[PDB]
Amino acid sequence: VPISPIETVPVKLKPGMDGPKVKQWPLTEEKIKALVEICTEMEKEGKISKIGPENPYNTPVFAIKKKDSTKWRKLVDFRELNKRTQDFWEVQLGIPHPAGLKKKKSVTVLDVGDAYFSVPLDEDFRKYTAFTIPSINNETPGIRYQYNVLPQGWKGSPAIFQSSMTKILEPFAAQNPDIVIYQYMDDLYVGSDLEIGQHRTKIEELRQHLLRWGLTTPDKKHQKEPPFLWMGYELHPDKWTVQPIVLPEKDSWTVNDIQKLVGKLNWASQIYPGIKVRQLSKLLRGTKALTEVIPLTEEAELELAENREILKEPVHGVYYDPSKDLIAEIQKQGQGQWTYQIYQEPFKNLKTGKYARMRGAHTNDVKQLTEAVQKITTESIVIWGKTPKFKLPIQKETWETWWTEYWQATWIPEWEFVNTPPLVKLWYQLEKEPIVGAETFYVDGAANRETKLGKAGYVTNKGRQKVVPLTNTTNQKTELQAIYLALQDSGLEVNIVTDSQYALGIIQAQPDKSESELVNQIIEQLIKKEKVYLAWVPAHKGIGGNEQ
Amino acid sequence: PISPIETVPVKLKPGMDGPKVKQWPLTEEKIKALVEICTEMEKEGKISKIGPENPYNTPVFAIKKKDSTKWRKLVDFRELNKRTQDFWEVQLGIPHPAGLKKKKSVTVLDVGDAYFSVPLDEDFRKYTAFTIPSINNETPGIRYQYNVLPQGWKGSPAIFQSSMTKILEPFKKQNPDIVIYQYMDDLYVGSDLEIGQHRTKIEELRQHLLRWGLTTPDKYELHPDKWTVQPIVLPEKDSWTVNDIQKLVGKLNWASQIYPGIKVRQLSKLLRGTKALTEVIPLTEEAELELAENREILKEPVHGVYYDPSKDLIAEIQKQGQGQWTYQIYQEPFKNLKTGKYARMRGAHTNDVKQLTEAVQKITTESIVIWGKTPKFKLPIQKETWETWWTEYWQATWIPEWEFVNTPPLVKLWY
Ligand SMILES: N#C/C=C/c1cc(Cl)cc(Oc2ccccc2OCCn2ccc(=O)[nH]c2=O)c1
Q: Do A384 and B242 touch (CB under 8 A)?
A: no
Q: Do A405 and B380 touch (CB under 8 A)?
A: no
Residue B213 contacts A, CB cutoff 8 Å: no
**Is A211 within 8 Å of A246 (Cβ atoms)?**
no
The string of DSSP codes covering B39-85 is: HHHHHTTSEEE--TT---BB-EEEEESSS-SSEEEEE--HHHHHHHH
Interior CA angle at B50 toward B48 and B51, to 5°? 165
Q: Do B53 and A407 touch (CB under 8 A)?
A: no
CB atoms within 10 A of CB A239: 14
Number of Cβ pairs < 8 A linking chain A and chain B: 171
| DSSP symbol at A73 | E
Residue B275 contacts A, CB cutoff 8 Å: yes
CB atoms within 10 A of CB B331: 19
- Residue B130's φ and ψ, nearest 5 degrees, are -135, 165
If we measure between CA atoms, which residue out of A232, A229, A283 comes closest to residue A256?
A283
Residue B132 contacts A, CB cutoff 8 Å: no
Shortest alpha-carbon distance between residue B276 and chain A (Å): 5
A451-455: long-range pairs with CB below 8 Å, 24+: A454/A478, A455/A548
- Residue B126's φ and ψ, nearest 5 degrees, are -65, -15
- What Å distances lie between residue B151 and A200, A461, B119, CA to CA? 48, 67, 13
B293 alpha-carbon distance from chain centroid: 37
Q: How far apart are CA A434 and CA A533, in angstroms?
A: 6
- Residue A424's φ and ψ, nearest 5 degrees, are -90, 120
**Is B317 within 8 Å of B377 (Cβ atoms)?**
yes
Task: Give every CB contact of residue B308 below 8 A, 6+ residues apart in sequence.
Answer: B331, B332
If we measure between CA atoms, which residue out of B117, B131, B145, B124 comes closest to residue B2?
B117
Q: B212: buried, middle or exposed (CB in 10 Å: 19+, 13-18, 0-12)?
A: middle
Ligand 1 binding pocket (C-beta < 6 A) is A 96, 101-104, 107, 109, 180, 182, 189-191, 226, 228, 230, 235, 237, 319
Kindly report the length of chain B. 415
Which of A406, A411, A412 best probes binding to B when mutated, by most B CB atoms within 10 angstroms?
Answer: A411
Shortest alpha-carbon distance between residue B19 and chain A (Å): 12
Q: How far apart are CA A468 and CA A163, in angstroms?
A: 74
Q: Residues of B within the annotated binding site?
A: 110, 185-186
Which residues in chain B are contacts of A407 at CB distance < 8 A?
Answer: 318-319, 380, 408-409, 412
If we measure between CA atoms, which residue out of A267, A403, A35 comes closest to residue B352?
A403
Residue closest via CA to ligand 1's atom 3 equals A228
Q: How far apart are CA A135 and CA A132, in angstroms?
A: 9
Q: A98: buried, middle or exposed (CB in 10 Å: 19+, 13-18, 0-12)?
A: buried
Q: How far apart are CA B129 and CA B77, in angstroms?
A: 10
CB atoms within 10 A of CB B65: 13
Q: How far apart are CA B122 and CA B159, in angstroms?
A: 14
Experimental method: X-ray
The string of DSSP codes covering B379-391 is: ESB-HHHHHHHTT
Task: Give every CB contact of residue A140 below 8 A, 6+ residues apart in sequence.
Answer: none
Q: How far apart are CA B277 and CA B243, in angstroms?
A: 5
Q: How far apart are CA A255 and CA A275, in angstroms?
A: 20
Nearest to B28 among A166, A386, A538 (CB): A386
If we measure between CA atoms, which residue out of A320, A342, A318, A319 comes closest to residue A330?
A342
Kindly report the length of chain A. 548
Residue A92 contacts B, CB cutoff 8 Å: yes
Residue A188, H or E segment: strand A187-192
Residue closest via CA to ligand 1's atom 10 equals A189
Does the annotation place A298 within a ligand binding site? Answer: no
Q: How far apart are CA A59 and CA A80, in angstroms?
A: 8
Task: Characterize the bridge pairing of strands A180-184 and A72-76.
Answer: unpaired
> Which domains, and CATH codes, for chain A?
1-91+117-157 (3.10.10.10), 92-116+158-226 (3.30.70.270), 227-320 (3.30.70.270), 321-427 (3.30.70.270), 428-548 (3.30.420.10)
Residue A504 contacts B, CB cutoff 8 Å: yes
The b/e string for B114-139 (b: 16+ C-beta within 10 A; e otherwise) is: bbbbbbbbeebbebbbbbbbbbbbbb
- What Å distances lie between residue B190 and B47, B198, B224, B226, B371, CA to CA? 35, 9, 9, 14, 15
If we measure between CA atoms, which residue out of B134, B153, B128 comes closest to residue B34?
B134
First and final C-alpha spacing in chain A: 92
Residue A230 contacts B, CB cutoff 8 Å: no
Task: Give every CB contact of residue B348 below 8 A, 6+ residues apart in sequence.
Answer: none
B223: left (phi over 0), alpha (psi -120 to 50) or beta: beta
Residue B126 contacts A, CB cutoff 8 Å: no
**Is A248 within 8 Å of A255 (Cβ atoms)?**
no
| DSSP symbol at A394 | B
- Residue A165's φ and ψ, nearest 5 degrees, are -60, -40
Which of B20, B53, B393 best probes binding to A when mutated, by most A CB atoms within 10 angstroms?
Answer: B53
**Is A146 within 8 Å of A46 (Cβ atoms)?**
no
Shortest alpha-carbon distance between residue B166 and chain A (Å): 40
Shortest alpha-carbon distance between residue A513 and chain B (Å): 17
A417: which strand partners?
A392
Residue A419 contacts B, CB cutoff 8 Å: no
Task: Give every CB contact of residue A305 below 8 A, 6+ residues apart in sequence.
Answer: none
**Would you state the torsion angle of the CA atoms of residues B40, B42, B47, B49, taken in this order, to the nearest 10 degrees?**
140
Q: How many CA atoms lie within 13 A of B65 on its CB side?
A: 14
Which residues in chain A are contacts of B135 at CB distance < 8 A?
Answer: 100, 383-385
A62-70: long-range pairs with CB below 8 Å, 24+: A62/A31, A63/A31, A63/A34, A63/A35
Task: Give every CB contact of residue B225 below 8 A, 6+ residues apart in sequence.
Answer: B101, B102, B103, B104
Residue A399, H or E segment: helix A396-405
Interhelix angle A255-268/A298-311, nearest 10 degrees: 40
If we measure between CA atoms, which residue out of A465, A500, A486, A479 comes closest to residue A529?
A486
The string of DSSP codes covering B233-273 is: -----SS-BHHHHHHHHHHHHHHTTT-TT---HHHHGGG-S
Interior CA angle at B96 toward B95 and B101, to 5°? 165
Q: How far apart are CA B411 and CA B289, in angstroms?
A: 25
Handedness of CA B208, B212, B216, B217 (dihedral sign): positive
Which of B246, B257, B410 best probes binding to A when mutated, by most A CB atoms within 10 angstroms?
Answer: B246
**Is A99 within 8 Å of A1 (Cβ atoms)?**
no
Which SS3 state, helix, strand or coil, does residue B199 take?
A: helix
Q: How far apart are CA A184 and CA A186, in angstroms?
A: 6
> Which domains, and CATH codes, for chain B?
9-98+124-164 (3.10.10.10), 99-123+165-221 (3.30.70.270), 222-307 (3.30.70.270), 308-415 (3.30.70.270)
Q: B347: buried, middle or exposed (CB in 10 Å: 19+, 13-18, 0-12)?
A: exposed
Residue B353 contacts A, CB cutoff 8 Å: yes
Report the nearest atom of ligand 1 relative to the CA of A96: 8
The type of residue at B227 is: W
Give the distance between the most distant pair of CA atoms in chain A. Answer: 106
**Is A446 within 8 Å of A455 (Cβ atoms)?**
yes
Which residues in chain B are contacts of A440 at CB distance < 8 A?
Answer: 274-277
Q: Residues of B within the annotated binding site for Mg(2+)?
A: 110, 185-186
If we measure between CA atoms, which residue out of A26, A230, A245 comes closest to residue A136?
A26
If we measure between CA atoms, which residue out of A311, A316, A314 comes closest to residue A247?
A311
Q: How far apart are CA A271 and CA A341, in angstroms?
A: 9
Which residues in chain B are contacts of A183 at CB distance < 8 A?
Answer: 139-140
- What Å distances lie between residue A501 and A12, B271, B410, CA to CA? 59, 20, 9
Which SS3 state, helix, strand or coil, does residue A139 take?
A: coil
Handedness of CA B109, B115, B116, B118 (dihedral sign): positive
DSSP E strands in A219-263: the ranges are 233-235, 240-242
Taking CA–CA distances from B243, the nearest residue in chain A reads: A434
| DSSP symbol at A128 | G
The type of residue at A509 is: A
- What Å distances lie between residue B342 and B230, B325, B330, B346, CA to CA? 12, 5, 17, 13
**Is A316 within 8 Å of A343 (Cβ atoms)?**
no
- What Å distances lie between residue A266 and A46, A98, A263, A290, CA to CA? 47, 16, 5, 20
Which SS3 state, helix, strand or coil, does residue A102 take?
A: strand
Which SS3 state, helix, strand or coil, does residue B37 take?
A: helix
Nearest to A11 among B53, B250, B388 (CB): B53
A102: which strand partners?
A320
Which SS3 state, helix, strand or coil, does residue A532 take?
A: strand
Taking CA–CA distances from A443, the nearest residue in chain B reads: B274
Does the annotation place A68 within a ligand binding site? Answer: no
The type of residue at A304 is: L
**Is B15 within 8 Å of B123 (Cβ atoms)?**
no
Which residues in chain B are contacts of A505 at CB distance < 8 A?
Answer: 407-408, 410
**Is A427 within 8 Å of A514 (Cβ atoms)?**
no
Task: Give every CB contact of residue A46 below 8 A, 6+ residues apart in sequence.
Answer: A1, A3, A148
Which residues in chain A are contacts of B242 at CB distance < 8 A?
Answer: 544
Q: Do B382 and A374 touch (CB under 8 A)?
A: yes
Taking CA–CA distances from A438, the nearest residue in chain B reads: B276
Residue closest via CA to ligand 1's atom 24 equals A237
Which SS3 state, helix, strand or coil, does residue A351 take?
A: strand
Shortest alpha-carbon distance between residue B316 and chain A (Å): 13
